Structures are given as C-alpha cells and as structure tokens.
Symmetry: C3
Subunit: 158 residues, 3 copies
C-alpha cells in the first residue's frame, strides 16, 4: 500500500529535417522534433513521471543529453531503462496517463500504436496505459505549430 | 487496492458573444469560451482526467458539458472503477473566480455522485504572462484518482 | 486506504533586480522572480489533495508550506509523496535540487525519498523559453 505519484512535462521544437517520433511511432510529416535524442516528447514526459514517482530525480540526471552515445537515441530504450531503474528501486508501475498537445499532424490515428508501445516497454497490459491527444485551441506557440508538448502522470507502488 | 491516476488539460479562447461557463457556473463577463460544446474548460479537463485514469482514451474519442461529465462518470463506472477524488486548477487573468468556486465544486460533486470533500477546484492567474496573461484564453488542469 | 491526489501550478515573471528563490534556495542569477514558484505549486497540490481549497483562500513561502502541512494533518491526512517540475530556461538548476528537496522534506516532515524535484528548460519556446518567467508543477499523494 506504499503508493507514490509522479508527473512529467516535455516540449520540443518542431523543425524541418527531423523524424517525427511520438510514443515510439514514426509519423510521416514534413517536420519532426528537435533534440539530441530522437526527441520523443511523449516518452520523455512519461519517463520523467516515472523517475519522479520513484523519487529518482529526472530524465536529465539519468541520461546525459551531451553524451554521444545518446545522439539519436531510441527513447523507447530509454523508457525501458527508466522502468528497470524504477524496479531496481523497489517500485512496481500501476498505471500511466498522458496528453499530447499538437496543432498538427493529426494524432488520433496513431494513439493506439503509441499506447501499445508504452505498454510493451513498461511490461503493462494495455488497460493500464492511456494516451490522450489535444490541440491547443489555436493559442500560443503550440497553436502556431512551433513545438509539441506532452504531459504525463504515473502511479507506482513500493 | 487497484488504484489508478489520471490527468487532464484543456484550454479555450475567450471571445465576444458567448456566455462564460466554468464548472457549470455562468459567470458575468464580456466574453465567453469558444467551442463546439459550451466550452466548459474545467469540466473538460476533469472529464479527460477521469477517462485517463480509467484508461478509456479521451474526450475527443468519446464525444452541455455537465451532461458529458455525467456520461463520462457512467463510462468510468461501466469499466468497473469508483472515483475517489478530483482536484483541479483554473488559470484565468479575469474575471475573478473565487466567488464561484463553491458552486463549481457543488456542480462537479453532484455530477460525479461524490461528497463535496472529495472534489476540489483551485483558481490562479498567469501573472500577466502569455496568452493566458493577456486574457485570450482560460486553461484548466485536473487530476483524478479512481479504484477498481 | 483513503488515498487522495492533488495537483499544483504556479508561474512568476523573471526580471532583473530581484533575487531568484526556488524551493527555498537563493540561486545566483542576473534576474529573479517578481514568489517561490515551486513551494506554491506544492502547497496548492497539498491543499488540493485534502480538498481544502487553495493557497489564495488560506493565506516566507516555507512558513506557508509548513502551515499548509499542519492544516492537512488536522484535516486527518498524512502526506505520502510529492513530485514536481520546475521549467526555467536559465540558470542551471540541477546543482540545487538536493537543497530544494531537503527544504521541502523538512517543511513537510517527510523522509527525503518521498520528495522529488525535476528541472526542465522550455526549449526556447514561449515566455518561459525567453526567460521571462519560471513555472512550477507539482503532484501530491495523501491518505486519510
Ligand atoms: N527532453 C529532454 C530529456 C532528456 C535529458 N537528457 C536526455 C538524454 C537522452 C534523451 C533524452 C534526454 C531531451 O533532451 N530530449 O531530447
Ligand atoms: Zn524531450
Ligand atoms: Zn474543452
Ligand atoms: Zn506563486
């Protein structure tokens, strides 16, 4: 009954010449997310929520964003390693919820694939993983398509 | 002991000619929230947090925002979950929301068949920053705890 | 087994001529907040988990956090954990995280391993990315 909650946030700029990878899904699009890694904003937010629930710091503490070994890093591999460290700390994952905010492209066709990827990486059934997709109702830099944001919440138990 | 958490986010533009309805409360104001529904940003954020905790997707996949919140609660129950508590924040530079918070909590508690002491609504400004600080929209955030 | 969750949000403008205090820590930097954004978010998350309203209805931001914790306890709740994120484009916050965690854990009378603080930039986007403000987000779990 030693439950703990974590929360996560990430944002990346949307720029030409990059793959668009969200929730482990390579989405065909003229632009992609800019980062040292593959810039998977959704997986990073979930990773942060998991480290946070376990009181293990944050994604930047665990994976160096200047190490050449993480250039173009597969963020699913990072999420699996996060889950491994959370387990080593003594915690079991109970559920993850998340939101992606993007003006474009349409994300609804890809949500089920993202959910399946996250569930596989966390060794969870599909019914403990949720991904919600939103626009920002045309407001701000999100409404202008300059970046994509993700939010996440995770419940774990020791 | 099968607890789950959900989180929700919503934002809508403030435009002339619409009533301002937040948490089911009609607030006197020169503008109101723009949307296909009544654009109740707080009820939508709570609805998304409840769908998220139950792993039932989101408000866009599933659909007056109180009727929608009641239907969301029905679908959460249909999945086998009981709602334990909801917490939330509204971010608006104007108008003042404190006089309306208790009516909002009462509306949410009635719609979710919860006691008042399991529902919470918090009010914030954005310190004059961004589109929220310029009064161009209102944001809501929500967290929900459920149990199977 | 009567668990409850709360969530908190705060933001303040960042301009020259003020000290930068986050999580009770004075951080060397050319600008400061116009205002402890992290402690307020945590305070709001705790009031929210207890269904006691918000920081504006109830009230140094450390003294406020300690009083918030006292009211949460008198309402019958024990705090189980806090997690949080600070979004600031500059300065680097990683060197101060342990000091922030120590201050929060002390104020909440929690073991250190139940308090977490995460740090992010906003990738140069928006008022946060331009260094015009700093945001904090928080989540708290309590039990009656
Ligand atoms: N959002 C941050 C999270 C992060 C920090 N250090 C890392 C190292 C590898 C991958 C991601 C990270 C980022 O750098 N994405 O590319
Ligand atoms: Zn990232
Ligand atoms: Zn809405
Ligand atoms: Zn504040």
């Amino acid at each position: 009954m030693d439950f703990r909650i974590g929360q996560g946030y990430d944002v990346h700029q949307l720029v030409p010449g990059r793959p668009l990878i969200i929730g482990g899904v390579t989405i065909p699009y003229e632009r992609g997310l800019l980062g040292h890694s593959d810039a998977d904003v959704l997986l990073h937010a979930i990773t942060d929520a998991l480290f946070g629930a376990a009181a293990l710091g944050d994604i930047g503490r665990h994976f160096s964003d200047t190490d050449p070994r993480f250039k173009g890093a597969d963020s699913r591999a990072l999420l699996r390693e996060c889950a491994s460290r959370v387990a080593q700390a003594g915690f079991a994952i109970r559920n993850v919820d998340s939101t992606i905010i993007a003006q474009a492209p349409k994300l609804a066709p890809h949500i089920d694939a993202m959910r399946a990827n996250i569930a596989a990486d966390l060794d969870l059934p599909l019914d403990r993983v949720n991904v919600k997709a939103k626009t920002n109702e045309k407001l701000g830099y999100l409404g202008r398509g300059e970046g994509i944001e993700a939010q996440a919440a995770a419940l774990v138990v020791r």
